[PDB]
């Protein structure tokens, strides 16, 4: 009640007092890994796994179960415990499914190592947020959604370096994909090399009644802020976190929430696996008429495209306001969607994409500050784990279903991703 409040009030005036622009910049990098890591596994398993009838989707079903796990235990074993916990995993596996010798046993500790980075962006998002003062939330959180696009960009260069040709059998031995499955797992590694040196949040530590173990971290910060300017039961608790939030208090808000991270990751998932795959049926079929570097090159355009949009929304949500800029966003990206069936050509396919990276990046950065500000620390983690989850849950839903529509329909899916960013912007517009 009245000690809720009066703890959120001071710790956001010592967090404040701490100051910004050191430490912060220094976990900024830390957790980007982490994200990066994140983006690597999602594209190894959107436009590799393929390479290897949707097998590689299952990967998802891990990662939407680890999403759930990791970020409901974060919240009772720390942050930036079980985000350690939660990359040593997916590093684990990812090392192993190069040593071995299937795709029965490749697919298995591959979905191991999708069910450890499934817990990545939950805890990393709630786990930065927790040194982030009010004024710099969002533009800080803005920022961190550009390391997702930096981690595909660099697992696309891996596979069009190492593992450019479709051939990828596991029986022979010391084969070049599996030199490209190790190196993959190289931001993971690095991830939770460098997370081991940042400190437990200060938030967490409050909360769970170490009032000492979050001193020091929150001294640790305004020293380094300012040297450097100057001078089981455990999963009854899990339930209880996840049962809170759909209470009278986050009932309506859990479910609009659930509807628009649905909703938009669906879109979007769906879009940019099909996409590959309606240029390739283009230039087959214009070929007929009369590889993984194109992949690579729409990987490398698209995150420069959400660059502008990214910059753009990291420095004006403060101003114009989250709730606003996520609907506006969301509008936008659903116009733009609608817009992309026009591209009758790759060579404006192409833009129209980036059209729409540009414009929705926009969206998804709003998205991930708001489900941060609308959730308490006692279950910002969980919340933002179970609608990761969710998002999951619509990255199959998505690519499954686009996948299935890539020739057959010309303009189907930017259809059904055009109604489901309208539906999905509804749902945004009516958020608290
Ligand atoms: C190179 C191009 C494609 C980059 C485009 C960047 C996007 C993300 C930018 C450009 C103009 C921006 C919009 C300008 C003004 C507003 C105010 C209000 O209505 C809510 C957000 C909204 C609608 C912004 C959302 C983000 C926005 C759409
Ligand atoms: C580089 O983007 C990422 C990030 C993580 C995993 C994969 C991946 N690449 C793709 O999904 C392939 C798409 C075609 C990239 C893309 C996305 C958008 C919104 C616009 C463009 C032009 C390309
Ligand atoms: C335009 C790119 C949107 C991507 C898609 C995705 O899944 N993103 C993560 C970033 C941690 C998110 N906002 O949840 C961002």
Same mark, same amino acid.
């Given at each position: 009640?009245?000690?809720?409040?009066?703890?959120?009030?001071?710790?956001?005036?010592?967090?404040?007092?701490?100051?910004?622009?050191?430490?912060?910049?220094?976990?900024?990098?830390?957790?980007?890994?982490?994200?990066?890591?994140?983006?690597?596994?999602?594209?190894?398993?959107?436009?590799?796994?393929?390479?290897?009838?949707?097998?590689?989707?299952?990967?998802?079903?891990?990662?939407?179960?680890?999403?759930?796990?990791?970020?409901?235990?974060?919240?009772?074993?720390?942050?930036?415990?079980?985000?350690?916990?939660?990359?040593?995993?997916?590093?684990?596996?990812?090392?192993?499914?190069?040593?071995?010798?299937?795709?029965?046993?490749?697919?298995?500790?591959?979905?191991?190592?999708?069910?450890?980075?499934?817990?990545?962006?939950?805890?990393?998002?709630?786990?930065?947020?927790?040194?982030?003062?009010?004024?710099?939330?969002?533009?800080?959180?803005?920022?961190?959604?550009?390391?997702?696009?930096?981690?595909?960009?660099?697992?696309?260069?891996?596979?069009?370096?190492?593992?450019?040709?479709?051939?990828?059998?596991?029986?022979?031995?010391?084969?070049?994909?599996?030199?490209?499955?190790?190196?993959?797992?190289?931001?993971?590694?690095?991830?939770?090399?460098?997370?081991?040196?940042?400190?437990?949040?200060?938030?967490?530590?409050?909360?769970?009644?170490?009032?000492?173990?979050?001193?020091?971290?929150?001294?640790?910060?305004?020293?380094?802020?300012?040297?450097?300017?100057?001078?089981? /039961?455990?999963?009854?608790? @899990?339930?209880?976190? $996840? #049962? +809170?939030?759909?209470?009278? *208090?986050?009932?309506? =808000?859990? %479910?609009?929430?659930?509807?628009?991270?649905?909703?938009?990751?669906?879109?979007?998932?769906?879009?940019?696996?099909?996409?590959?795959?309606?240029?390739?049926?283009?230039?087959?079929?214009?070929?007929?008429?009369?590889?993984?570097?194109?992949?690579?090159?729409?990987?490398?355009?698209?995150?420069?495209?959400?660059?502008?949009?990214?910059?753009?929304?990291?420095?004006?949500?403060?101003?114009?306001?989250?709730?606003?800029?996520?609907?506006?966003? /969301?509008?936008?990206?659903? @116009?733009?969607?609608? $817009? #992309? +069936?026009?591209?009758?050509? *790759?060579?404006?396919? =192409?833009? %129209?994409?980036?059209?729409?990276?540009?414009?929705?990046?926009?969206?998804?950065?709003?998205?991930?500050?708001?489900?941060?500000?609308?959730?308490?620390?006692?279950?910002?983690?969980?919340?933002?784990?179970?609608?990761?989850?969710?998002?999951?849950?619509?990255?199959?839903?998505?690519?499954?279903?686009?996948?299935?529509?890539?020739?057959?329909?010309?303009?189907?899916?930017?259809?059904?991703?055009?109604?489901?960013?309208?539906?999905?912007?509804?749902?945004?517009?009516?958020?608290?």
């Amino acid at each position: 009640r009245k000690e809720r409040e009066e703890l959120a009030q001071q710790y956001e005036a010592i967090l404040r007092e701490c100051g910004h622009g050191r430490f912060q910049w220094t976990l900024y990098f830390v957790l980007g890994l982490a994200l990066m890591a994140d983006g690597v596994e999602v594209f190894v398993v959107g436009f590799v796994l393929p390479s290897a009838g949707m097998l590689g989707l299952i990967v998802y079903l891990g990662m939407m179960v680890g999403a759930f796990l990791w970020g409901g235990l974060a919240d009772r074993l720390g942050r930036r415990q079980c985000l350690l916990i939660s990359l040593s995993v997916n590093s684990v596996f990812a090392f192993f499914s190069s040593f071995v010798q299937g795709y029965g046993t490749f697919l298995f500790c591959r979905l191991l190592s999708g069910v450890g980075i499934g817990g990545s962006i939950p805890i990393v998002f709630s786990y930065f947020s927790e040194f982030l003062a009010q004024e710099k939330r969002g533009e800080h959180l803005s920022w961190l959604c550009m390391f997702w696009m930096i981690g595909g960009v660099y697992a696309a260069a891996m596979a069009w370096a190492i593992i450019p040709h479709y051939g990828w059998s596991f029986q022979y031995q010391f084969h070049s994909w599996r030199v490209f499955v190790l190196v993959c797992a190289f931001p993971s590694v690095f991830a939770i090399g460098a997370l081991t040196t940042q400190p437990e949040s200060p938030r967490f530590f409050l909360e769970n009644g170490k009032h000492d173990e979050a001193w020091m971290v929150l001294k640790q910060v305004h020293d380094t802020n300012m040297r450097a300017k100057g001078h089981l /039961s455990l999963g009854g608790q @899990v339930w209880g976190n $996840f #049962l +809170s939030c759909f209470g009278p *208090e986050y009932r309506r =808000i859990t %479910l609009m929430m659930m509807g628009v991270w649905f909703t938009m990751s669906f879109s979007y998932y769906g879009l940019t696996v099909w996409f590959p795959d309606m240029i390739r049926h283009l230039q087959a079929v214009d070929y007929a008429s009369r590889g993984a570097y194109m992949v690579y090159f729409v990987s490398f355009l698209g995150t420069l495209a959400v660059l502008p949009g990214n910059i753009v929304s990291a420095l004006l949500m403060d101003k114009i306001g989250r709730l606003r800029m996520l609907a506006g966003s /969301s509008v936008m990206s659903c @116009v733009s969607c609608f $817009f #992309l +069936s026009f591209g009758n050509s *790759e060579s404006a396919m =192409i833009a %129209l994409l980036c059209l729409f990276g540009g414009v929705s990046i926009a969206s998804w950065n709003a998205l991930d500050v708001l489900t941060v500000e609308l959730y308490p620390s006692d279950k910002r983690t969980t919340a933002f784990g179970f609608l990761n989850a969710l998002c999951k849950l619509a990255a199959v839903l998505g690519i499954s279903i686009f996948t299935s529509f890539v020739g057959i329909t010309k303009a189907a899916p930017i259809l059904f991703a055009s109604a489901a960013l309208a539906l999905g912007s509804s749902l945004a517009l009516k958020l608290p």
